[PDB]
Design a protein around this ligand. Structure first.
Ligand SMILES: CCCCC/C=C/C/C=C/C/C=C\C/C=C\CCCC(=O)O[C@H](COC(=O)CCCCCCCCCCCCCCCCC)COP(=O)(O)O[C@@H]1[C@H](O)[C@H](O)[C@@H](OP(=O)(O)O)[C@H](OP(=O)(O)O)[C@H]1O
Ligand SMILES: CCCCCCCCCCCCCCCCCC(=O)OC[C@H](COP(=O)(O)OCCN)OC(=O)CCCCCCCCCCCCCCCCC
Ligand SMILES: CC(C)CCC[C@@H](C)[C@H]1CC[C@H]2[C@@H]3CC=C4C[C@@H](O)CC[C@]4(C)[C@H]3CC[C@]12C
Ligand SMILES: CC(C)CCC[C@@H](C)[C@H]1CC[C@H]2[C@@H]3CC=C4C[C@@H](O)CC[C@]4(C)[C@H]3CC[C@]12C
Ligand SMILES: CC(C)CCC[C@@H](C)[C@H]1CC[C@H]2[C@@H]3CC=C4C[C@@H](O)CC[C@]4(C)[C@H]3CC[C@]12C
Ligand SMILES: CC(C)CCC[C@@H](C)[C@H]1CC[C@H]2[C@@H]3CC=C4C[C@@H](O)CC[C@]4(C)[C@H]3CC[C@]12C
Ligand SMILES: *[C@@H]1O[C@H](CO)[C@@H](O)[C@H](O)[C@H]1NC(C)=O
Ligand SMILES: [Ca+2]
Length: 1260
């Protein structure tokens, strides 16, 4: 049968896999053992599938005798299927191991060798990320322990009315309160704080054990629902110090970690494109584009002689060619496209009846005129030269589609879908007048050249979603049916619904809600029931990795080729225009101590602006700051006065005078103080912007951002055009259709008047009368300016499922919703998310990365210096031996040898590991015996750690002990726990947090974690001004928010509450941080719209005077600018460390060169520079051949060359470490024949940093 398992028997079993994948998507999970006919026949078909796979297993197991992973997986699936079928026939948890059927789609990857390569390229890019997964795990553990020690059991009480404990009488969302002696949220008028409450999320979200806390910390790290936890803690303990926990956790484990991931992935993509260039693949793309260039060239020249007639087309056809390329037929078509866009983007809801006539006549006249355009271009330029180009085929398709789809809406067969909106994609022809069109054409060329790889990465992305959708359907199918009056929309009941839910989890929005529903579907918070959260954890952290390795590996690997093609076409043009044109052509202003004081006053005038009181119109604090501004602006005027004697202007003194003039005319009017003041006090936020031209480096990192902004002017305009097109298509689908009545039984505005009966919590015995209101969606598709705002919030992955499930229910204009009407309309949102929120955003990030690479890398050195020998010679010049501190008076040497042994390290590491375990099982509700045991167990750990501190201080001496930073870090921990024990046997918690920091010592171990973290921290420190831009942005926007939305009333049912408001600078900064992390920022935006209530203190005109419409611009601009600046800082830090991110550890470098120092250390205690001649035999053989040679005996050619290379100018064993290191590194790489020593001598004084005449002894 070794013959029968070849030929298309492997295609038969592939079609069988495809059939079993369709028989899995048709199955409908029914609650409580229900079924239908289809699910009854599918089980019968499973027998055929299983019998087919079992004979495949037989024929491959008696013909091969398993070693491969895929065949073993197939055997496992077959065995589990047999066992499940037999068990089900026996009983007739039975159907609980059917979840192994979802691993059968994984056989499609193995069935074709063209996708195994892609899967391996995706999976092997992950092993460099295991040095970031460990860091994330350590951060999670440390923060879980800190939350255990800070917020354990504090979220188990809430307002309970005053009749007893009836049922959590505060809406459907009860929040934790605190007792009258507490510092948390106090209960309302007719309520009392009383314990005995499940928890904020049915007891799932809390810090009770190391299982709840370790999952709450992870959920916060994924930046989803972290403000909810922060506000629950705020209501529990207080509003003073949970932000120090949560904001630090977000910064350390969500932004820093993502920066590390981006750096490691970009340095790995570059370290493969460099290999591809070395082998050669750009040449194929380059030598193909010039081919069709001449095939667009000479092949038009052949057709230009087609009508040289020596039957009378020369009169007209010669003019048709001229007119087409006359810059008249190029501007006329642009004007027509602009007109078409104008009449397409003018379709609103309830438009005037004449507009719907003008636009439909235009949609026919312009369509006919464009058809005439096509016909004129085709026959007058060759019918096969109209297919050579890419826009020409696109225009052909769009014209033909417009003509075809016009009829289907003309006579009612089909409902409009905006087919002509794609002529706009011809406005991108206006880029021809700009230089930014050869750059945008090569990107499309690379995208269309790597189509076979894009369509395979997308296929793997879809297979992942399908497999996890089937698994979620198996687990949670027919289980999200709870008795609560709300029917969950994101469920796992169908195949399309499962696909939508898995896609929503992959996008990240509200994944924690689906996880909570899944946890409560399998019971509640309990050991066996809560174990179904690994599904949502693994799905999130293994789908967000695939979404970032599929789309970034397409953006960066294609933009790098696009820029290479652009460079090639830019040098070819220059060479042609240079050689082809070569045969024919041939006073205290300038102080230093005064500018730094003016800068201090500038920075002081911005604190008096952030300390104001937005609400209280008249207050004491508002009086001195209004009084201190008099002296503040006078000095800025005296500085401005003193600068007109010096000279008589630049583009920064304009702003410097603008602020002073604004302040003066603010104090100038002083009489119209109800007007202008609230539109002139907003321009006071330009006060911090006066340090841009006074704090050089801040001037450089503002020039760099403005140079970088003009470079992304292609990615920002193409994305805007795509968003406009998608909005125009969405207005034709959801205009006038997203309206709803409060009474779900009424589907007309003339039918939604009056009051209706509502039942609280679905209790029929408790009716409540509510008014009937006809309302629209929060974000609608009525205009072309509302669709672009509804789509922006979708692209930011905020509240997009709500819009999805509101648009699915829409069926008819001027009508209400219908449950699951057009579930097939979700493809619109899926395509928009894939194209805009996944493809174009990653293109923008990759463009920033590549642009920074070229901007900061093209200089290099231009003088040989290969990219390892550079640092090799640099450290050869700058080096010295280490210090050892051997303890003379051997009474100390015994203890020192004991301490510096390799067993003390393991003993201490095990001690820390046991301490972190003893701190990891302090639960809530522990018995008193457990608490006393915990105390008299921490006692021993503190004792052994203080004796180890003493026994290390004795050996290393107080001079050599505290010198190393690690001992002083442990010194506080031991002291922080010694005093903690004393005050624990008898009120503070900050001393307990010291013990957890001991795990940081274990974290900072290994040569990968330590090196990566240290290099990234150093790169962060090397650019302190790039991070100042974000601080300035946050400060400016916080001040603006304080002056605009600072007076809005604090209702707890809105998004402007006690926790979230603009009433203080810290609160405004926290709100802006929340919006930067993307946490219902659109809800805060809509809670700041005009027509809300002002606030007690901020003074009637109180109909509703608060809210500005400035909110839309404020929030959208802040989101865009914050994202841009965060990406800017991220890429700057990443490419400040690109020599480590592309290290190629298999070749010489700092790693072995630094170890040479330590292997020297013992032989030479002091630095000095004197050597032992006994070294030769063992010197290089001590470590490895990567530095020296492979431990060979001191009689080989390697040993002969060890002495043959003359030690530079040193008698006997007095060679300096620099000389021997340089000789070693020049033997290891870049070897040269004798007589070139003077060449190296002259090279080491030309382009390297100054030697300071310190190589005078190292010359020969
Ligand atoms: C705050 C509490 C404590 C924070 C940290 C305390 C630090 C005090 C001790 C500092 C020791 C610093 C010396 C040190 O060891 O620096 C790092 C390790 O440090 C970490 O990873 C340290 C990583 C720290 C991670 C912090 C995350 C923990 C979260 C805290 C939770 C706080 C939450 C608070 C909640 C409050 C609620 C109210 C390693 O130092 P190194 O020995 O590798 O570096 C040397 C040297 O610097 C060379 O320049 C370096 O070359 P490059 O690598 O090319 O730069 C050589 O490095 P390699 O040998 O690796 O090539 C080495 O030859
Ligand atoms: C990505 C890069 C991000 C960079 C920006 C990070 C932003 C971190 C956010 C910092 C502020 C956090 C919010 C905050 O301070 O908490 C609010 C709270 C005020 O609440 P309060 O009215 O005091 O409480 C009433 C009931 N006791 O606070 C207080 O109690 C006052 C604490 C004052 C803190 C001053 C420093 C904050 C501003 C830094 C700029
Ligand atoms: C060429 C592209 C980029 C810009 C097109 C701008 C025009 C066609 C669009 C943009 C903003 C639109 C307006 C946005 C809002 C309103 C208010 C309401 O009464 C519906 C129509 C009306 C008045 C729209 C008419 C069409 C409109 C003016
Ligand atoms: C591979 C990843 C994505 C999924 C892992 C699934 C496995 C390891 C987990 C996740 C869900 C878990 C189930 C969750 C809840 C229950 C209900 C109860 O009767 C105990 C066992 C049982 C049935 C668990 C068994 C183990 C389980 C099936
Ligand atoms: C480098 C600079 C720009 C960073 C920002 C520092 C300034 C603007 C911030 C940092 C901390 C802030 C203070 C934090 C807390 C309070 C208490 C509050 O009841 C009034 C405002 C006041 C007094 C803030 C004034 C502005 C402040 C001093
Ligand atoms: C860091 C390593 C040791 C992981 C720690 C896991 C162990 C030690 C922790 C995590 C989950 C914990 C359990 C979670 C919930 C409860 C219910 C509570 O009413 C009694 C304690 C008990 C039963 C906890 C005991 C300790 C526990 C088993
Ligand atoms: C929220 O604000 C106040 C606070 O009570 C009140 O008007 C009402 O509860 C809410 N506002 C509206 C308009 O419903
Ligand atoms: Ca969200």
């Amino acid at each position: 049968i070794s013959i029968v398992e070849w030929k298309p028997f492997e295609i038969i079993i592939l079609l069988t896999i495809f059939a079993n994948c369709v028989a899995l998507a048709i199955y409908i999970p029914f609650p409580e053992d229900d079924s239908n006919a289809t699910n009854s026949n599918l089980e019968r078909v499973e027998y055929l599938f299983l019998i087919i796979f079992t004979v495949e297993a037989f024929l491959k197991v008696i013909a091969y005798g398993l070693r491969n992973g895929w065949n073993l997986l197939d055997f496992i699936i077959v065995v589990v299927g047999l066992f499940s079928a037999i068990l089900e026939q026996a009983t007739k948890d039975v159907k609980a191991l059917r979840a192994f059927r979802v691993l059968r789609p994984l056989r499609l990857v193995s069935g074709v060798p063209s996708l195994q390569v892609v899967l391996n390229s995706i999976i092997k890019a992950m092993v460099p990320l295991l040095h970031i997964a460990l860091l994330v795990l350590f951060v999670i553990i440390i923060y879980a322990i800190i939350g255990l020690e800070l917020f354990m059991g504090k979220m188990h009480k809430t307002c309970y009315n005053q009749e007893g404990i009836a049922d959590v009488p505060a809406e459907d969302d009860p929040s934790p309160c605190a007792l009258e002696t507490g510092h948390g949220r106090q209960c309302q008028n007719g309520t009392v704080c009383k314990p005995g409450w499940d928890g904020p999320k049915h007891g799932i979200t809390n810090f009770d054990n190391f299982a709840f806390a370790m999952l709450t910390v992870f959920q916060c790290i994924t930046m989803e629902g972290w403000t909810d936890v922060l506000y629950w803690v705020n209501d529990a303990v207080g509003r003073d110090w949970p932000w120090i926990y949560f904001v630090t956790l977000i910064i350390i484990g969500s932004f820093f970690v993502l920066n590390l991931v981006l750096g490691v992935l970009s340095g790995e993509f570059s370290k493969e494109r460099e290999k591809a260039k070395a082998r050669g693949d750009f040449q194929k793309l380059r030598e193909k584009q010039q081919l069709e260039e001449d095939l667009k060239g000479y092949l038009d020249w052949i057709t230009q002689a087609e009508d040289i007639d020596p039957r009378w087309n020369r009169f007209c056809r010669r003019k048709c060619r001229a007119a087409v390329k006359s810059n008249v037929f190029y501007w006329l078509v642009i004007f027509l496209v602009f007109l078409n866009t104008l009449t397409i983007a003018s379709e609103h809801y309830n438009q005037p009846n004449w507009l719907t006539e003008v636009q439909d006549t235009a949609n026919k006249a312009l369509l006919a005129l464009f058809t005439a355009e096509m016909l004129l271009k085709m026959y007058s330029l060759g019918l096969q030269a109209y297919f050579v180009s890419l826009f020409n085929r696109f225009d052909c398709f769009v014209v033909c589609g417009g003509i075809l789809e016009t009829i289907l809406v003309e006579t009612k067969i089909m409902s409009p879908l905006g087919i002509s909106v794609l002529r706009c994609v011809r406005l991108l022809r206006i880029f021809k007048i700009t230089r930014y069109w050869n750059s945008l054409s090569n990107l499309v060329a690379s995208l269309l050249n790597s189509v076979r790889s894009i369509a395979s990465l997308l296929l793997l992305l879809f297979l992942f979603i399908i497999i996890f959708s089937l698994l979620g359907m198996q687990l949670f199918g027919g289980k999200f049916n709870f008795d609560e009056m709300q029917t969950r929309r994101s469920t796992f009941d169908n195949f399309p619904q499962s696909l939508l839910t898995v896609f929503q989890i992959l996008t990240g929005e509200d994944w924690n809600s689906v996880m909570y529903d899944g946890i409560m579907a399998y019971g509640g918070p309990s050991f066996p029931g809560m174990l179904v959260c690994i599904y949502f954890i693994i799905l999130f952290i293994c789908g967000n990795y695939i979404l970032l390795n599929v789309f970034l590996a397409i953006a960066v690997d294609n933009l790098a080729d696009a820029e290479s093609l652009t460079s090639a076409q830019k040098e070819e043009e220059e060479e042609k225009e240079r050689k082809k044109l070569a045969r024919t052509a041939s006073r205290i202003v300038n102080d230093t101590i005064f500018t730094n004081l003016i800068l201090f006053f500038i920075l002081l005038s911005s604190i008096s602006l952030a300390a104001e009181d937005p609400v209280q119109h008249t207050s004491f604090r508002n009086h001195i700051l209004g009084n201190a501004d008099y002296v503040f602006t006078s000095i800025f005027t005296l500085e401005i006065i003193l600068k007109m004697t010096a000279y008589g202007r630049n583009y920064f003194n304009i702003l410097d005078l603008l602020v002073v003039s604004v302040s003066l005319i603010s104090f100038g009017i002083q009489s119209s103080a109800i007007n202008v003041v609230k539109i002139l006090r907003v321009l006071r936020v330009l006060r911090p912007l006066r340090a841009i031209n006074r704090a050089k480096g801040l001037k450089h990192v503002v020039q760099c951002v403005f140079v970088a902004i003009r470079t992304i002017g292609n990615i920002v305009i193409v994305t805007t055009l795509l968003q406009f097109m998608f909005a125009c298509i969405g207005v034709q689908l959801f205009k006038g259709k997203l309206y709803t009545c409060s009474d779900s039984s009424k589907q007309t505005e003339a039918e939604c008047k009056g009051n209706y009966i509502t039942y609280k919590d679905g209790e029929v015995d408790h009716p409540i009368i509510q008014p009937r209101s006809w309302e629209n969606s929060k974000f609608d598709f009525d205009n072309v300016l509302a669709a672009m705002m509804a789509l922006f919030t979708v692209s930011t992955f905020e509240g997009w499922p709500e819009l999805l499930y509101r648009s699915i229910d829409s069926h008819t204009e001027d009508k209400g919703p219908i449950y699951n009407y057009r579930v097939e309309i979700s493809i619109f949102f899926i395509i928009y998310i894939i194209i805009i929120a996944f493809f174009m955003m990653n293109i923008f990030v990759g463009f920033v990365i590549v642009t920074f690479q070229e901007q900061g890398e093209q200089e290099y050195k231009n003088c040989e210096l290969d990219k390892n020998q550079r640092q090799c010679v640099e450290y050869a010049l700058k080096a010295r031996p280490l210090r050892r501190y051997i303890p003379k008076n051997q009474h100390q040497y015994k203890v020192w040898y004991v301490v510096n042994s390799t067993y003390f390290e393991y003993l201490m590491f095990v001690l820390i590991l046991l301490n972190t375990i003893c701190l990891a099982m302090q639960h809530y509700g522990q018995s008193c015996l457990f608490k006393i045991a915990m105390n008299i167990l921490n006692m021993l750990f503190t004792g052994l750690f203080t004796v180890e501190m003493i026994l290390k201080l004795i050996a290393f001496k107080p001079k050599g002990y505290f010198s190393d930073p690690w001992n002083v870090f442990d010194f506080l921990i031991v002291i922080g726990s010694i005093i903690d024990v004393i005050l624990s046997e008898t009120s503070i918690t900050f001393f307990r947090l010291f013990r957890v920091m001991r795990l940081v010592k274990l974290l900072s171990r290994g040569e990968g974690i330590r090196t990566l973290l240290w290099t990234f921290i150093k790169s962060f420190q090397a650019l302190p001004y790039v991070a100042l831009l974000i601080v300035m942005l946050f400060f400016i926007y916080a001040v603006i928010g304080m002056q605009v939305f600072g007076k809005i009333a604090l209702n707890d049912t809105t998004e402007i509450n006690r926790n979230n408001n603009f009433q203080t600078f810290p609160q405004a900064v926290l709100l802006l941080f929340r919006c930067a992390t993307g946490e219902a920022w659109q809800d805060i935006m809509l809670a700041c719209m005009p027509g809300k209530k002002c606030a007690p203190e901020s003074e009637t005109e109180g109909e509703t005077p608060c809210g500005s419409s400035f909110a839309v611009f404020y929030f959208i601009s802040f989101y865009m600018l914050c994202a841009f600046l965060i990406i800017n800082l991220f890429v700057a830090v990443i490419m400040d460390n690109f020599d480590y991110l592309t290290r190629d550890w298999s070749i010489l470098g700092p790693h072995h060169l630094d170890e040479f120092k330590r292997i020297w250390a013992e032989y030479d205690p002091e630095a000095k520079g004197r050597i032992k001649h006994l070294d030769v035999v063992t010197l290089l053989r001590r470590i490895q051949p990567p530095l020296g040679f492979g431990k060979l005996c001191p009689h080989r050619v390697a040993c002969k060359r060890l002495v043959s290379m003359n030690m530079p100018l040193n008698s006997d064993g007095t060679v300096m470490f620099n000389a021997t290191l340089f000789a070693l590194v020049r033997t290891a790489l870049r070897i040269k024949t004798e007589g070139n020593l003077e060449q190296a001598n002259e090279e080491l004084r030309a382009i390297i940093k100054k030697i300071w005449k310190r190589t005078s002894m190292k010359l020969l």
